[PDB]
Amino acid sequence: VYFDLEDLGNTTGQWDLYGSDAPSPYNSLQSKFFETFAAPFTKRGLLLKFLILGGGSTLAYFSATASGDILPIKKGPQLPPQLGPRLG
Amino acid sequence: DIAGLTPCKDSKQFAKREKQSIKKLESSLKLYAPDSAPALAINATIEKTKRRFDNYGKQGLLCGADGLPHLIVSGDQRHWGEFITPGILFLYIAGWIGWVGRSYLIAIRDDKKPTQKEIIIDVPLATGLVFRGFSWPIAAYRELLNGELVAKDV
Amino acid sequence: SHSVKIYDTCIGCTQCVRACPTDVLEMIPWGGCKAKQIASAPRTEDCVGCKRCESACPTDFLSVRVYLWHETTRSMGLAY
Amino acid sequence: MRDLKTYLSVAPVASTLWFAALAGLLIEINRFFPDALTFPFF
Amino acid sequence: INLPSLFVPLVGLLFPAVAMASLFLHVEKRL
Amino acid sequence: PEVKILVDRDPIKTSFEQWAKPGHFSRTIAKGPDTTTWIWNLHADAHDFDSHTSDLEEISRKVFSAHFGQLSIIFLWLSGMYFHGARFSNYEAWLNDPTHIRPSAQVVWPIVGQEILNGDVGGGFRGIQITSGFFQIWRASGITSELQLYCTAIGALVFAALMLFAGWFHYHKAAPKLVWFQDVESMLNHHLAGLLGLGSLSWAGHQVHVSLPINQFLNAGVDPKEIPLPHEFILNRDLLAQLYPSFAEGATPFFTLNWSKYADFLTFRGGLDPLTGGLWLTDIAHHHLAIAILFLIAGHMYRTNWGIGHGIKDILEAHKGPFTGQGHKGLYEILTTSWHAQLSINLAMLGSLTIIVAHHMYAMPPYPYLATDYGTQLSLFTHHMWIGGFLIVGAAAHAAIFMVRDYDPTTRYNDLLDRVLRHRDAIISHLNWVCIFLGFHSFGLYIHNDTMSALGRPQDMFSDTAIQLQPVFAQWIQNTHALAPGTTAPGATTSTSLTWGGGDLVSVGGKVALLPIPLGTADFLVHHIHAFTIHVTVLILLKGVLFARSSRLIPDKANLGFRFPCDGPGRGGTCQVSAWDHVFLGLFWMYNAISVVIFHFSWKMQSDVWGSINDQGVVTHITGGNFAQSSITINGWLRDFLWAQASQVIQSYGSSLSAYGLFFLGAHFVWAFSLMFLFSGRGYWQELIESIVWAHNKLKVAPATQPRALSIVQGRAVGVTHYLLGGIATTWAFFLARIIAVG
Amino acid sequence: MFLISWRGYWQELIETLAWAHERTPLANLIRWRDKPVALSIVQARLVGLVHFSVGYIFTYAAFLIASTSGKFG
Amino acid sequence: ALRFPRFSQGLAQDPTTRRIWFGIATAHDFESHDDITEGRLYQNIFASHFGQLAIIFLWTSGNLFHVAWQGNFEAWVQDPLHVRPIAHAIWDPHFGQPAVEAFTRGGALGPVNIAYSGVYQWWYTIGLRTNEDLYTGAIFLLFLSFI
Ligand code: CLA
Ligand code: CLA
Ligand code: CLA
Ligand code: CLA
Ligand SMILES: CCCCCCCCCCCCCCCC(=O)OC[C@H](COP(=O)(O)OC[C@@H](O)CO)OC(=O)CCCCCCCCCCCCCCC
Ligand code: SF4
């Protein structure tokens, strides 16, 4: 018998099968450090606008100032061009 | 001439094609024996080729720069053998078939189980009906004047 | 929810109610036919729209009609 | 025997025979008057 | 200072990025 | 309990009355037609025996006699083959010089100019070059005159009449009852030990007395007319002892157990015969002897009537463990009451067997002068691959039929079937995933390669020159197969095939019979493509079988049958939920997989195997060896395979290969014609037929059997039938024209 | 594909996939907001036809331009 | 409403992915939207026409600007039969060096496309001769798009 109108979640199976609920295994000197230094990146609108505009900044930057060893599109042609079937 | 086409008797290209095909055949021939059955077959084909080209020469067909025969269907009278008289033959035979079929359909339409005579033919009945197509034109004419060909009120 | 409508040409054969897989239809009393019966569709919020009822109706033209309309969870037949 | 006469008039057999005869007729015509492009008679 | 060196990237990379996040947030929003 | 013959007398009476009443078998068809739909149903349900009736006895009687009819047909086809070899062929001249005369056993009448199809096949003869490989069989048989071919044609005709009479007899006069059919132990004992054991024993006998000596004489150079007749070898034995001294002791060894003294003609050589490019006949006879012994022993496993033996029920009930509950208990009751379960298992095994036959016959050529006849080899591999694929797909069809019409946990419960049914969701989930992953990592590599080759970046490709993906295990295994003779097989001289390696190359008439086949990055890519296609086909067919009875979408699907169009447009739309539609979809994917298999084999053989060798010993392959570097992109398949090899067939007009040029185009047409049935639906067609019917009614010429548009399922079936015919025939014409033209 | 395969097959496949996802660890911490479903019938016809004619135009354009431009004559 | 799409309430209450698809493919069928009048339909269509006009002007603006900027026109006017007209430049970071060399033609200083729309012949036929005419026209088209 697995039907109980009082408790519905046990009848429809709302368990956490792998959760733990044990205390923290990262002793506080380590946790202390992280939750001090990693706080300013924890607001939704803040993080999103910052990530978008910073990624765009780095992309426009590294795109405008990439060197020839990287991108053959930058090194240009190095040969005299052919003529077409008639034209050229 | 008509549309610039000159006669196959006077066409040099028509001749060239004939002799090219003939001696290609005869190059394929020079083998197997001078009398074996393959040789006899190949010689029969050669003679048939000559007959074909000469018949197209006799019948006054028109040739172009390709060297092949062309067809004039405009109504000109020098060329009725090309389209109009075989066309009359076709229209006659086709009407024959269709007329016999419609008269069979009509003959069986009053049966209690008409579909039984559609998937299993009544051969003596059809045998009596086949030869009315011989005069299907006159019958169809007097059936049109009768108000009898077109189902009224459809 | 789809729409299901019953028209007065119904002969009250009940074949449509027997066919519904979600129990949309029902027979109700009437006076317009030899059977004194007519179909009704009281539970159209459960109709999946299979038209299994229309395949069963014998009148010409149909006496039950299914008009597909806005879709929901029950209408789409989703078990998740 | 009557049942056989009926069966022989069922649609597939009847059409098979009709077209085999027609095929023989056209084949023999073309074997006698080969390579016809026109009506060369009148 | 190369002009396509800037416009091709951002129209090709960041324009669709911002527009896809934009339209996702809009289209899954219940008012 | 015991096993015996059980038969009824005169169950049905021979009569013509049922011929004149179309659709006697089904009550619905018997009533007669109102619409044209009738005519279609009449043919679709003609052999659906277990739907015409409910009685198992009647279904089994019908099945037995139908099998006799099929065997009679096969005998008639064999009779035709032998008669045509005897009467309209150049077999004797080919027997005289096999590496110059190309075989031909069909001539055409000179009717409308078609005699051009009678081409110069050599030997003073003009006809159609055949590719079934029958001359090779007849030479390996010892046949040397056309009188023997006549004799076998007559014998086959007699056997066909005999089969037809037995088919009539076992249905109308002496029809066995259900208990006779349901005895599977005696049946297996007979087919294992009687059909397969005695069969290969008798055949080993014929090879020891006819094929071996006549082929010894033929390979010695003797004129095929001055060779003694086979029966002489049996009357006079000194003839045999001249070629094989061991035939002087004559069965004394076989009893004195000194089988060593037969090493004359029962060998274990391995490799090919360097004179004819085939397997040693002294190996094949010994093989058949061993196989006959094995089968004759294996046909004594099951208990019939004398206690000793094995009960199948006992074996099945004994097997079970802690993961499978009670498994195998209840399969004997199932496998003896449904014909569809049996048919599914049998079709699966026979299809797999046909594919294995294709591989083994290319890799270790059995007949003499077959390896250098390239057209026959291509034809045989391709034919048998197609047959195997089709049979495997039918296996799925009949598993689905069993699940819909026969599975019944109320009276025949099996545990394993129930458990698979209870986790089908996880099954289909994992198979779906692995097909997606396999498709990304094989076709994706091709797309990467095409894009890197078009972007002028060939050093970033997946190839032998830039980024290597060597199949280490395949190379390791064929290296083990190379070192096998002498180390793990001390009794063998050469290894099983020449594809394994060892540096041995066999030539015949200046042509290459066999040599070691090299495996490289391209082989790795092609094989993973193959794994991908097979996994997808399996997904479709197994999804069709496992969900044939019910789903989360349609929870009572078994009540709608096995072949139904849909369950209406509701629930979102439920077109093609039936299992028949899954078979219909799996046919396209089987076509895809087999087509890629035969393209891979055809290009690889020409590129690295076939060709011509010079007296100095420099092999020139048909294609230049471009498979290693052009097969890795899609553009190389379109350019170097399709465009470059279609030249032979698009240039055959005017030659004796022009029939292939006509069939190329006809097959393209039929393929494109099927798309009309596949892309449309019957509502449009019935509404158009309405107006056409009006026009006929206007002239009192309208038919009484009302014309309808085809069924929904019939539309799908016509579509897939024409699609498969068009595609396969296109490849048929392409292959045959190409291979016949170059050589 | 969209023109020969129709909807029911795909809808059943998708139900299987939804089960698979909801049952797997560390990935069921993510929840879609629209229940996935196969495409519609009319929608499938439209999408198939669009792919068909896009392919049509693109292949013919590529061939026409490359075979005239290659000869330039 | 309270969800995309606004014009259809029946689609907005659809909890499956269908809602999104059909939301896009019904957006310009104004007669099928909730609370549609005759005036709303006509006025919507009028504004839509104006939008399409702006679109066309911006597209032809783009063509003019781009062959005036990355183009070939001036050299083409000197010898229409012996030079290939340029459409625009190629900038693609997935290019390798040989492709870079392969697409550099028409006298350009880097990879380009050859035009086949025929606009050099048409503009040459009606009067435009130097790059300033093409720039002029492009700016005027931008103006007409805005209007
Ligand atoms: C597309 C336009 C067109 C059309 C419609 C025609 C039509 C015709 N042209 Mg013409 N022509 C054309 C363009 C055209 N031409 C052009 C552009 C040129 C310049 C090259 C010519 C040059 C040209 C020439 C030089 C001649 C014609 C002639 C003719 C007539 C020949 C056919 C005939 O004699 O009747 C038909 C012939 C019959 C014997 C009639 C029998 C048909 C039967 C009755 C019908 C069969 C029905 C069925 C079997 C039985 C009935 C059953 C019923 C009771 C239900 C014909 C009416 C010829 C002419 O003047 O005619 C004398 C002619 O000399 N044309
Ligand atoms: C519809 C006309 C049109 C079209 C089809 C193109 C197409 C192209 N442009 Mg161009 N452009 C145009 C108008 C157009 N442009 C106009 C009017 C100007 C100002 C005079 C420019 C200025 C411009 C520059 C400076 C560059 C390009 C570049 C490019 C190429 C790279 C792709 C890209 O980065 O997008 C275009 C990038 C832009 C910044 C264009 C912005 C200006 C237009 C008006 C944006 C229009 C967007 C609009 C809101 C949406 C309209 C709807 C419809 C087009 C879908 C590409 C082939 C790059 C190139 O040459 O590649 C090698 C390059 O760097 N364009
Ligand atoms: C040594 C005994 C023996 C042999 C040789 C065979 C052989 C065969 N059986 Mg069979 N069977 C046997 C015993 C045997 N059976 C027993 C004891 C039972 C159960 C009591 C069955 C029940 C059975 C069934 C239900 C079926 C077969 C079938 C077949 C055919 C399988 C298809 C095939 O491979 O064709 C190979 C073709 C050839 C080898 C050509 C040569 C044919 C020879 C002449 C066969 C003759 C063998 C036969 C037993 C002769 C007895 C008849 C005699 C009284 C006159 C095959 C010829 C299938 C069938 O009947 O197809 C018609 C099938 O449906 N068998
Ligand atoms: C030992 C082999 C075998 C056997 C005995 C059966 C037996 C049976 N099958 Mg089955 N099947 C098989 C193999 C086999 N199948 C294979 C290999 C496949 C995969 C394709 C299938 C797939 C399949 C399906 C999908 C179905 C069956 C069905 C059936 C049942 C009815 C068949 C029928 O009468 O339809 C009538 C037969 C025809 C109408 C003939 C069809 C003609 C084809 C389409 C043309 C082929 C073209 C030809 C080869 C070349 C062209 C010639 C032309 C140009 C002139 C029957 C019990 C049906 C069933 O309902 O089961 C209960 C069912 O629907 N089978
Ligand atoms: C260069 C710019 C190109 C756009 C020019 C066209 C705009 C001028 C005419 C518009 C008339 C507006 C009519 C009132 C319509 C109106 O403004 O009503 C406001 C609308 C509410 O809809 P309603 O309740 O009015 O619906 C009634 C409808 O029947 C009327 O269409 O809310 C929205 O804005 C939804 C936004 C979805 C936006 C979807 C994104 C679509 C992307 C592309 C959009 C066009 C870009 C084309 C570029 C390729
Ligand atoms: S009738 Fe055709 S389109 Fe409609 S649901 Fe059935 S299969 Fe699909």
Side-chain angles (χ1 to χ4, degrees), chain E residues 3-4 7-8 11, chain H residues 58-59 61-62 65-66 69-70 88-89 91 142:
Chain E
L3 216 30
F7 287 125
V8 176
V11 173
Chain H
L58 177 63
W59 158 75
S61 147
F65 163 73
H66 256 269
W69 185 37
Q70 301 165 356
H88 60 89
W91 212 83
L142 202 90

Side-chain angles (χ1 to χ4, degrees), chain F residues 431-445:
Chain F
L431 181 49
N432 175 288
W433 166 78
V434 75
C435 309
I436 306 198
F437 155 94
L438 229 56
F440 270 151
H441 288 73
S442 64
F443 184 60
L445 302 176

Side-chain angles (χ1 to χ4, degrees), chain F residues 43-44 47-48 343 390-391 394 397-398 401 405 562-563 580 583 587 721:
Chain F
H43 295 90
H47 302 151
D48 198 2
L343 189 49
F390 270 100
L391 299 172
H398 285 273
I401 300 168
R405 293 174 168 190
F562 162 71
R563 175 172 89 228
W580 189 95
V583 170
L587 277 161
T721 314

Side-chain angles (χ1 to χ4, degrees), chain E residues 2-31:
Chain E
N2 195 34
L3 216 30
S5 178
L6 192 89
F7 287 125
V8 176
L10 309 162
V11 173
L13 279 199
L14 200 139
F15 163 81
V18 62
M20 280 170 343
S22 194
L23 277 151
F24 171 78
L25 292 200
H26 162 78
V27 152
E28 293 177 350
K29 193 59 189 267
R30 291 84 202 80
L31 291 183

